[PDB]
Write an enzyme that holds these catalytic residues in place. Structure first.
Site, PDB file in Angstrom:
ATOM      1  N   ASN A 108      -3.649  22.672   3.190  1.00 56.79           N
ATOM      2  CA  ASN A 108      -3.798  22.434   4.738  1.00 56.79           C
ATOM      3  C   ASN A 108      -4.952  22.315   5.144  1.00 56.79           C
ATOM      4  OD1 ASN A 108      -0.812  22.654   5.709  1.00 56.79           O
ATOM      5  ND2 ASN A 108      -1.096  24.705   5.112  1.00 56.79           N
ATOM      6  N   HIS A 134       6.021   9.001   5.032  1.00 55.27           N
ATOM      7  CA  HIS A 134       5.128   8.547   5.115  1.00 55.27           C
ATOM      8  C   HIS A 134       4.750   7.022   4.806  1.00 55.27           C
ATOM      9  CE1 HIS A 134       3.185  11.564   1.734  1.00 55.27           C
ATOM     10  NE2 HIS A 134       3.075  11.800   2.496  1.00 55.27           N
ATOM     11  N   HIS A 170       5.482  21.422   6.065  1.00 54.58           N
ATOM     12  CA  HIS A 170       4.262  22.539   5.298  1.00 54.58           C
ATOM     13  C   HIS A 170       5.062  23.730   5.602  1.00 54.58           C
ATOM     14  CE1 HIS A 170       1.237  20.216   3.929  1.00 54.58           C
ATOM     15  NE2 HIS A 170       2.263  19.697   3.381  1.00 54.58           N
ATOM     16  N   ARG A 199       4.663  16.726   9.570  1.00 50.04           N
ATOM     17  CA  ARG A 199       4.257  16.986   8.432  1.00 50.04           C
ATOM     18  C   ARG A 199       4.788  18.539   8.428  1.00 50.04           C
ATOM     19  NH1 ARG A 199      -1.678  16.991   6.025  1.00 50.04           N
ATOM     20  NH2 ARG A 199      -0.972  16.695   3.749  1.00 50.04           N
TER      21      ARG A 199
END
Ligand code: HEM
Ligand SMILES: [Ca+2]
Ligand SMILES: [Ca+2]
EC number: 1.11.1.7
Length: 306
Positions: free
Chosen positions: A70, A170, A42, A38
């Site tokens: 975040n 996910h 990001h 992740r």
């Protein structure tokens, strides 16, 4: 041009050092692989994969760590510091934090049972962080499918395959109750739960996330295999068991004519999913990178070199 062989002469053991660090960390924190993947996502969605997300606050610019996507969510920063230090010891001033995080993401996926591949390398580190850009560019769980598509296209990923395959991230990891409370009790101000959420699963989630309960409580993104990187995520969507709104919309949105066939294809074949995931991952990893002499090879991922 980014190339998988970038460090084959200057630091041939970089991938192994990264792997070793993650294996060690996984023993005490089984969620770290998901967390690291992740972080890379990001990073790439804000000014590209330039390790901008790893920078801490300075009096001139705010850290992306305080972005809505975040703050009190992104994690694993100390682990990245650990592997960086280990890599710096083996190969001083050679591997950029941007590349380190990219390798870490790939190794995390493989360690969790996903595909194995060599990521393109040659990225360099940013000279600043972009908080406003992070707030604007990171997608949110309450986004509609058109908004999700907009978010991806905004950073350079035009293909629905990019969106459907990368959402496969996910297949593991955790999600806070706060992000699904609307789906469970009052979706879109209807006073009713999200109709696209399986009613049996709805009961289970309500038990984990009661109204007025701990919004920071964590729930698994994939009820089938919580920590294994596999295509079970798509099987869940087919049964209306995607956890967050943005997951289920890939299969149930009125605008999902193009995404439904992809969801089915990935649910039907691990190979099809894995191939698409690698393809999409490398495309995301190619988003506006600093290369050549642009940027730096940051020594401490938290601060720009001085
Ligand atoms: C398509 C839009 C996406 C949205 C709206 C989104 C949203 C979220 C949200 C709400 C969380 C929960 C954070 C928390 O509760 O603290 C999360 C976690 C996570 N996301 Fe996504 N995500 C998206 C795409 C992706 C992509 C492209 C990847 C990577 C390829 C990814 C990988 C992860 C992982 C692995 C976690 C778990 C991290 C952990 O447990 O520490 N996400 N995401
Ligand atoms: Ca970035
Ligand atoms: Ca899984």
């Amino acid at each position: 041009q980014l190339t998988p062989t970038f460090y084959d002469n200057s630091c041939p053991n970089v991938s192994n050092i990264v792997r070793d660090t993650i294996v060690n960390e996984l023993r005490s924190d089984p969620r770290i692989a998901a967390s690291i993947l992740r972080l890379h996502f990001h990073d790439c969605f804000v000014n590209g994969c330039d390790a901008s997300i790893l920078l801490d606050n300075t009096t001139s610019f705010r850290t992306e760590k305080d972005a809505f996507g975040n703050a009190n969510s992104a994690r694993g920063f100390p682990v990245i510091d650990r592997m960086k230090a280990a890599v710096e010891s083996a190969c001083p001033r050679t591997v950029s934090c941007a590349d380190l995080l990219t390798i870490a993401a790939q190794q995390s996926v493989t360690l969790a049972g996903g595909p194995s591949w060599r990521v393109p390398l040659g990225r360099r580190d940013s000279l600043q962080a972009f908080l406003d850009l992070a707030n604007a560019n990171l997608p949110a769980p309450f986004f509609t499918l058109p908004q999700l598509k907009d978010s991806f296209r905004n950073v350079g990923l035009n293909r629905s395959s990019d969106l459907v395959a990368l959402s496969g991230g996910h297949t593991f990891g955790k999600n806070q109750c706060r992000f699904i409370m609307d789906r469970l009790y009052n979706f879109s101000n209807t006073g009713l739960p999200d109709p696209t959420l399986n009613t049996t699963y709805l009961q289970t989630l309500r038990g984990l996330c009661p109204l007025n309960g701990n919004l920071s409580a964590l729930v698994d993104f994939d009820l089938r295999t919580p920590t294994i990187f596999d295509n079970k995520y798509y099987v869940n969507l087919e049964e209306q068991k995607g956890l967050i709104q943005s997951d289920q919309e890939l299969f149930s949105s009125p605008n999902a004519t193009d995404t439904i066939p992809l969801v089915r294809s990935f649910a039907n074949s691990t190979q099809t999913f894995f191939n698409a995931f690698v393809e999409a991952m490398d495309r995301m990893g190619n988003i506006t990178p600093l290369t050549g002499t642009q940027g730096q090879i940051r020594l401490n991922c938290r601060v720009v070199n001085s």
